[PDB]
Structure 1
Amino acid sequence: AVQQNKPTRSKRGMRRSHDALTAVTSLSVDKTSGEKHLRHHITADGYYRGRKVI
């Protein structure tokens, strides 16, 4: 469990290649208050598909 050389930035990036975080693909919109909340999630207001919960 001890290395014998110092590897390079090339190998460091070649490992770091697969760190590809993607963002949210698209958001989704209400039908009585109209904001861009997450898909299958409540709004910050408290709306979900028409209802105003609290």
Structure 2
Amino acid sequence: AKHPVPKKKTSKSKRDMRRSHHALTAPNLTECPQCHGKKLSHHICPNCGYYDGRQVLA
């Protein structure tokens, strides 16, 4: 029942543009509180456990 399926090949080029608009952006991250390492902005880690409270492990 394929009423409409593309009529033309798609243009290598353009095709890719389409893809184009699409951009990767590494998670903003910030250095630790004191477990000194880099971390996911805002959170404890297998480095930390702090924040202001010792909740976590290792």
| TM-score (structure 1 length as normaliser) | 0.68
Structure 2 equivalent of residue 34 of structure 1: 36
Which of the two has greater strand per residue?
Answer: 1
2:17 to 8, 14, 38: 14
User: Where does the alignment leave 5 or more consecutive residues of structure 2 unmatched?
Assistant: none
Work out the number of aligned pairs and report it: 53
RMSD over aligned Cα, in angstroms? 1.9
Which amino acid in structure 2 is aligned with residue 49 of structure 1?
Y
Contact 2:29 2:39 in 1 (8 A): no
CA deviation vs aligned residue, 1:7-40 (integer Å, no higher than 9, x gap): 2111111101111011123422222x32222111
**SS of 2:18 mapped into structure 1:** helix
Q: Distance in 1 between matches of 2:21 and 2:47?
A: 37
Which amino acid in structure 1 is aligned with residue 37 of structure 2?
E
Q: Is the counterpart of residue 24 in structure 1 residue 30 in structure 2?
A: no
